[PDB]
Design a protein around this ligand. Structure first.
Ligand SMILES: *[C@@H]1O[C@H](CO)[C@@H](O)[C@H](O)[C@H]1NC(C)=O
Ligand SMILES: Cc1cc(C(=O)O)c(C)n1C1CC1
Length: 359
């Protein structure tokens, strides 16, 4: 019933423009489960693209205009009909105002125009929540969508480590990464990396990670080593290095993946070259998920999922995502009879799953 805005009390943890970061909170005092949701919204990997994002998407860079309340929807809803999984949880929504895929971990220098503090924002939200009942939590689910799903992968182990270092070893830290599992693949048609939505995924993160001074999980960093940490923004590379349980939710044909690949489907006839490209994309995505034991990957063309009102509708092999997530909870109390957690479609074309969203 509406989460309430709290601006971070540590004034030095700022949005892009130096305004305080924050979080929305709806407490549920009978529950020991905490859902910390990371918002998405692309990124800006250089001055010019950030200055334009400040003109047109200022709320993804500044708290000054945030409303004092927000409604929790989808997995953040308290209504059983809308959220059969965790409707009774303590609900936290962390707005995305650092444009850095939640990786920036450095106080802005006076030499730079913007502050990129995404990873510090998460850290400080968790610390301030400790005094608001988080300290009594049994499960902390760090969830997020699109850029926030990739933020989950980059941050879930830091949160686990922060809570252990702070003296709360009993809180189980888990991750739910929605629509943030990207391929560093070749574009269908080549584009110059000029702007956010059509710059190839590899060059975007190469430029960004330098621009934001971004940090990646330690074990992944040590594999790719200096100057190749961009690799760790790609789920199939960073996920094997994570210690924390992570459930992965990912459309096989994510619209943001297709956009950075310069694929636009307008209902026009799809020539052989594009058909082959799209089919191989779904196959490669399927391949990267084969060893992700807790996953939900429907063969749909869509953008993101878990905070939308109707996130309960999609099914893979007869199982909804809320049920898969409950089976995942159970598995963390090997395979459970009647309660599957590995749900990856195998059919090869957008909407070959009849339960895909029609919107
Ligand atoms: C406040 O935030 C800064 C990050 O700029 C951090 O280094 C510092 O330790 C924090 N301390 C407190 C008490 O908030
Ligand atoms: C990291 C990231 C976030 C988003 C996003 O759409 O929100 C995209 C496309 N990427 C890179 C292509 C991997």
């Amino acid at each position: 019933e509406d989460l309430r805005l709290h601006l971070l009390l540590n004034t030095s943890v700022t949005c892009n423009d130096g305004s305080p970061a924050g979080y929305y909170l709806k407490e549920s005092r009978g529950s020991r489960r905490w859902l910390l949701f990371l918002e998405g919204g692309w990124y800006c990997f250089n001055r010019e693209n950030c200055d334009s994002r400040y003109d047109t998407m200022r709320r993804l860079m500044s708290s000054r205009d945030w409303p004092r309340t927000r409604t929790g929807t989808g997995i953040l809803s308290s209504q059983p009909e809308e959220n059969p999984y965790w409707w009774n949880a303590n609900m936290v929504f962390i707005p995305y105002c650092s444009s850095d895929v939640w990786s920036g971990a450095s106080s802005k220098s006076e030499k730079n125009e913007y502050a990129f503090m995404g990873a510090l924002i998460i850290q400080e939200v968790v610390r301030e929540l400790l005094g608001r009942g988080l300290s009594g939590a049994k499960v902390l689910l760090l969830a997020g969508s699109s850029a926030g799903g990739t933020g989950v992968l980059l941050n879930v182990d830091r949160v686990a480590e922060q809570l252990e270092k702070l003296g709360y070893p009993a809180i189980q830290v888990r991750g739910l990464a929605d629509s943030g599992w990207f391929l560093d693949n070749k574009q269908y048609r080549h584009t110059d990396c000029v702007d956010t939505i059509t710059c190839a995924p590899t060059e975007a993160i190469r430029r960004g990670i330098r621009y934001w001074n971004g940090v990646v999980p330690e074990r992944c960093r040590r594999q790719f080593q200096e100057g190749e940490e961009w690799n760790c923004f790609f789920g199939y590379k960073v996920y094997p290095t994570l210690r924390s349980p992570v459930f992965v939710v990912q459309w096989l044909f994510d619209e943001a993946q297709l956009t950075v690949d310069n694929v636009h489907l307008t209902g026009q006839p799809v020539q052989e070259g594009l058909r082959l490209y799209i089919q191989n994309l779904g196959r490669e995505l399927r391949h990267t998920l084969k060893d992700v034991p807790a996953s939900f990957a429907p063969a749909c063309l869509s953008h993101e999922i878990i905070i939308r009102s109707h996130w309960t509708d999609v099914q893979v092999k007869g199982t909804s995502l809320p049920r898969a997530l409950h089976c995942w909870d159970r598995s963390l109390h090997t395979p459970l009879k009647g309660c599957p957690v590995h749900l990856v479609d195998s059919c090869p074309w957008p909407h070959c799953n009849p339960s895909c969203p029609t919107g």
